[PDB]
């Protein structure tokens with residue numbers, strides 16, 4: 702689990718969105734595993750606006766943060782789960798590192814701020830849903 706709080710927005714994995722997230726829906730994209738809902742309180746997370754390929758992510762299944770190199774956001778084939786059939790997930794970045802399904806929502810951050818959240822994995826590769834292109838999160 703995990704979320705990003707910026708301005709009057711909450712960014713979560715679409716497959717983990719609650720009834721309250723769907724009742725206050727701003728934007729969602731099944732192909733990216735992202736959903737953004739509105740909040741009453743102001744969030745103070747900083748979103749990165751960059752092309753970094755190195756950062757640190759939080760892994761809840763290890764209670765640890767790991768430094769990784771990661772690919773640029775791209776269209777990657779993702780195997781079926783209980784939440785989606787097999788499909789291409791867009792704006793996804795991979796890194797060599799540990800993750801389990803319950804790690805979704807862990808934040809990946811670079812020197813400039815929040816880059817994305819854990820969304821996919823397996824075989825020693827962790828995948829992050831990028832949020833750096835969502836320029837509207839900041840206004």
Ligand SMILES: Cn1ncc2ccc(CN3C[C@H](C(N)=O)CCC3=O)cc21
Nearest residue numbers: 734779782785800801802820821822823
């Ligand atoms: C984060 N992670 N680490 C290992 C692993 C193994 C399997 C999965 C399967 N999966 C992928 C889904 C998607 N984004 O298409 C989101 C929900 C989900 O359980 C995720 C995994």
Ligand SMILES: [Zn+2]
Nearest residue numbers: 751753811813
């Ligand atoms: Zn950066």
